[PDB]
């Protein structure tokens with residue numbers, strides 16, 4: 001709660017900055033710090049390895065003004081259908097970023113605000129329970145820092 005929310009905005013703003021665009025950055029606003037970085041690099045290397053797979057993921061969802069949060073959670077469960085894991089999770093963050101980057105290409109920067117929220121809810125009702133039973137995020141940074 002809250003904490004995870006900060007990570008989203010950070011990861012999002014970061015993914016956007018990579019494409020030139022910008023937004024409410026959060027690299028040194030709240031806390032975490034190490035986590036934000038660990039997750040930042042991870043998402044970068046992750047996509048680099050699975051450039052093909054992920055490419056299909058983003059194509060399995062076209063976020064639009066008339067899109068229900070359900071559709072989103074439906075596409076995020078398929079990945080976590082065979083149990084949750086640090087890696088598969090790292091993708092979730094990347095998935096949200098892609099959808100956002102696409103929302104900006106179609107002149108729709110008012111969606112990123114909604115996408116960020118959707119990720120927060122899904123994180124605090126599907127991943128939070130697990131992350132807590134895996135040594136919190138501190139473990140993710142200690143293993144994949």
Ligand SMILES: COC1(Cc2ccccc2)CCN(c2ccc(C(=O)NS(=O)(=O)c3ccc(NC(C)(C)CSc4ccccc4)c([N+](=O)[O-])c3)cc2)CC1
Nearest residue numbers: 042043045046050053054057078079085086087088090144
């Ligand atoms: C086809 O099924 C898939 C593709 C897919 C299916 C459906 C929808 C979307 C995608 C499902 C998604 N997927 C993978 C592939 C591997 C793992 C994996 O190795 N997980 S892990 O828990 O073993 C791990 C390994 C390495 C790192 N970090 C390193 C050491 C820095 C390497 S870079 C990296 C980062 C994060 C994840 C993986 C690599 C981290 N981590 O940082 O959390 C975590 C997880 C999902 C590709 C196949």
